[PDB]
Amino acid sequence: MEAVQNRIVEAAERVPGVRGVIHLRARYVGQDIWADMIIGVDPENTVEQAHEICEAVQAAVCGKIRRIESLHVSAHARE
Amino acid sequence: MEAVQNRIVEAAERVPGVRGVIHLRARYVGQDIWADMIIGVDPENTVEQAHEICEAVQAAVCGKIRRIESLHVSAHARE
Ligand code: NI
Ligand code: NI
């Protein structure tokens, strides 16, 4: 699991507009991972931009870690 | 293991100068992976350049897949 969490954080951090991973909770449901995360974003990004960054994180993380079958990504102002 | 082999191939293919993965054999030794691979390279690269590409593949693949504890990379002319 720690190897999986490290991969999730690394994948998320490589997406344009991510200012770190604030929170990540991952759980196994069988052999699948279900995860919930919060990313940091520029406080001056629009809410629509933050939504786009979250969607990009979801695509990036699910594309790179095939065992993830549910991923929720939300955003919070940081830096 | 197939998930691991897919990650090895994908990581190798993203290194400048790799013209596909020609061969990959991976084995578990305990929880560790030992692997041997052959990459394709430009036939007009020098032997020194091919050596540099192999070393770059080794770094890239070992950096991305933490369970690998031995990786040998060789090169063959392709395309
Ligand atoms: Ni949308
Ligand atoms: Ni050298």
Side-chain angles (χ1 to χ4, degrees):
Chain A
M1 181 60 97
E2 201 172 88
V4 172
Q5 292 202 83
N6 279 142
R7 289 169 62 200
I8 293 170
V9 174
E10 290 167 345
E13 294 187 338
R14 297 285 67 77
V15 178
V18 177
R19 294 188 168 185
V21 174
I22 292 168
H23 172 63
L24 170 63
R25 178 167 268 128
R27 276 304 100 70
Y28 272 107
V29 179
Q31 81 188 17
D32 297 338
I33 292 279
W34 288 27
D36 181 42
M37 64 193 310
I38 308 176
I39 56 164
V41 299
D42 182 342
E44 305 304 309
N45 283 163
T46 62
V47 167
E48 192 60 19
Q49 283 170 324
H51 157 69
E52 292 170 356
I53 297 162
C54 290
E55 286 195 333
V57 170
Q58 192 187 32
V61 170
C62 295
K64 285 171 171 192
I65 304 145
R66 267 61 61 156
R67 77 189 73 190
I68 296 173
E69 292 295 347
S70 181
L71 176 61
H72 290 159
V73 186
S74 65
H76 192 281
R78 200 184 205 177
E79 171 182 303
Chain B
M1 181 60 97
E2 201 172 88
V4 172
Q5 292 202 83
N6 279 142
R7 289 169 62 200
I8 293 170
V9 174
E10 290 167 345
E13 294 187 338
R14 297 285 67 77
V15 178
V18 177
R19 294 188 168 185
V21 174
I22 292 168
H23 172 63
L24 170 63
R25 178 167 268 128
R27 276 304 100 70
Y28 272 107
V29 179
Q31 81 188 17
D32 297 338
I33 292 279
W34 288 27
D36 181 42
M37 64 193 310
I38 308 176
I39 56 164
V41 299
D42 182 342
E44 305 304 309
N45 283 163
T46 62
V47 167
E48 192 60 19
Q49 283 170 324
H51 157 69
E52 292 170 356
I53 297 162
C54 290
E55 286 195 333
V57 170
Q58 192 187 32
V61 170
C62 295
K64 285 171 171 192
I65 304 145
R66 267 61 61 156
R67 77 189 73 190
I68 296 173
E69 292 295 347
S70 181
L71 176 61
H72 290 159
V73 186
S74 65
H76 192 281
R78 200 184 205 177
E79 171 182 303

